[PDB]
Design a protein around this ligand. Structure first.
Ligand code: NAG
Ligand code: NAG
Ligand code: NAG
Ligand code: NAG
Length: 413
């Protein structure tokens, strides 16, 4: 039959209750199997356990000195002193797959195999499409430590040619952009949509390049990975937060921490592997103290902290709103005073129980590589678009303002 090239792809994402990781699913191998993979926005590539329960007649090792090896970074050339199979081959290109949850990397072989996912028109699940020789990294079973039950690897979405967004765009000839719509649901799927906009969420809410607010995509010249070579830039997505307001009032910050130095320290990145936004200690202190004060001004009393949080509150006087609990707003001010990432109660707060709610940010310590890491809870129910062709990040704010959610995409497996 003819196989039409897609204009976009959709994969499901579901939050894991125990680990707070976001887990996607793709199909791979011959015969085709479903793979659950932890989403790593900042990861270099797809990596999978090739050592254990990996059977495929379409698997091919990527040899050293090939164009595929170059696409993967020409990091290493390896040999394996065990029997030949997926993950163990001679004269094979190597990389260092990383598990950022445990902050570990280890050597893995580069390989090709069939990857199959659903196309989309932006509104519903469509016909399946395939990349017959999708380049990925093998990894050992031990690298899976502390990942959600049932996963076999990680889906890296970072700024490399072989990461999912770029490799799908090149394979299918669509735009080098993707959109992530994470959910706090642990029972229902949300989505990542690779390729062209627009995106529809039930009932009829359109999110598109018209509706999104954009900010420049910045580059950190020093890697933020666990392994790297000298002179390698970060593959992560940075944005230029200049100031923070809480309840419309500036929270005074050390601005040198918000800039990215030539040594690669500072700035603001977006992460799916940190479940809560992580703040350098001085920023953490400033933000939490202002939030506590502004909360007290509306009769929301501070109560004992609940790990991992350091600013927790009684719910006695908190009103429920469409945009979440009625707590002080937090604005991350970007390239001008009129371009802001706004965090309403649905994204700022984490319920512990009926009586206690916490500000969902954590103290990352002092002398931290990245000063602000926008994490999973703060991404939920927001559509975030990463456009590598135009070097921009777009964001919707909470979809609750439009009476929809990220789990309201019309996805069918
Ligand atoms: C690689 O070559 C070495 C040395 O000849 C050999 O001992 C080993 O079995 C080989 N590994 C394979 C083919 O995966
Ligand atoms: C601000 O951050 C820089 C970078 O760490 C540091 O050198 C400086 O001492 C800090 N300033 C204040 C007022 O804490
Ligand atoms: C609420 O807090 C405000 C500001 O602190 C205070 O002036 C007011 O008395 C409080 N209202 C109560 C406790 O009903
Ligand atoms: C999902 O989209 C398909 C294609 O239009 C449609 O047939 C189906 O009824 C939709 N499902 C929901 C729940 O809207």
């Amino acid at each position: 039959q003819p196989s039409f090239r897609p204009s976009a792809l959709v994969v499901p994402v579901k939050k894991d209750a125990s680990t707070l990781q976001y887990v996607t699913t793709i199909n791979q191998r011959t015969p085709l199997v479903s793979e659950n993979l932890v989403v790593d926005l900042g990861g270099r590539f797809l990596w999978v356990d090739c050592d254990q329960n990996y059977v495929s007649s379409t698997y091919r090792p990527v040899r050293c000195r090939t164009s595929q090896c170059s696409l993967s970074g020409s990091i290493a050339c390896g040999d394996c002193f065990n029997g030949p199979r997926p993950g163990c081959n001679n004269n094979t290109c190597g990389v260092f797959p990383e598990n950022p949850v445990i902050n570990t990397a280890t050597g893995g072989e580069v390989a090709e195999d069939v990857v199959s996912v659903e196309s989309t028109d932006g509104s519903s699940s469509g016909r399946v499409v395939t990349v017959p020789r999708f380049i990925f990294s093998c990894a050992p079973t031990s690298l899976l430590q502390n990942l959600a039950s049932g996963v076999v690897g990680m889906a890296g979405l970072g700024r490399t040619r072989i990461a999912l967004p770029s490799q799908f765009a090149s394979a299918f000839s669509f735009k080098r952009k993707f959109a992530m719509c994470l959910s706090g649901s642990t029972s229902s799927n949300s989505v990542i949509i690779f390729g062209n906009d627009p995106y529809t969420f039930l009932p009829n809410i359109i999110v598109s390049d018209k509706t999104l607010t954009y900010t420049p995509l910045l580059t950190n010249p020093v890697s933020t990975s666990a392994t790297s070579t000298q002179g390698e830039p970060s593959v992560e997505y940075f944005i230029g937060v200049k100031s923070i307001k809480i309840n419309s009032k500036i929270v005074a910050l050390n601005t040198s921490l918000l800039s990215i130095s030539s040594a690669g320290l500072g700035g603001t990145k977006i992460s799916t592997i940190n479940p809560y936004t992580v703040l350098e200690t001085s920023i953490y202190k400033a933000v939490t103290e202002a939030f506590i004060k502004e909360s007290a001004a509306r009769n929301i009393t501070r109560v004992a902290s609940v790990a991992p949080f350091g600013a927790c509150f009684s719910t006695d006087n908190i009103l429920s709103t469409r945009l979440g609990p009625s707590v002080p707003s937090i604005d991350l001010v970007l390239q001008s005073e009129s371009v802001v990432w706004t965090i309403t109660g649905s994204n700022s707060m984490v319920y512990i129980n009926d009586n206690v709610v916490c500000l969902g940010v954590v103290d990352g310590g002092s002398n931290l590589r990245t000063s602000i890491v926008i994490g999973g809870h703060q991404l939920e129910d927001n559509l975030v678009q990463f456009d590598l062709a135009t070097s921009r990040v777009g964001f919707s704010g909470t979809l609750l303002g439009s009476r929809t959610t990220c789990a309201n995409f019309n996805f069918t497996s």
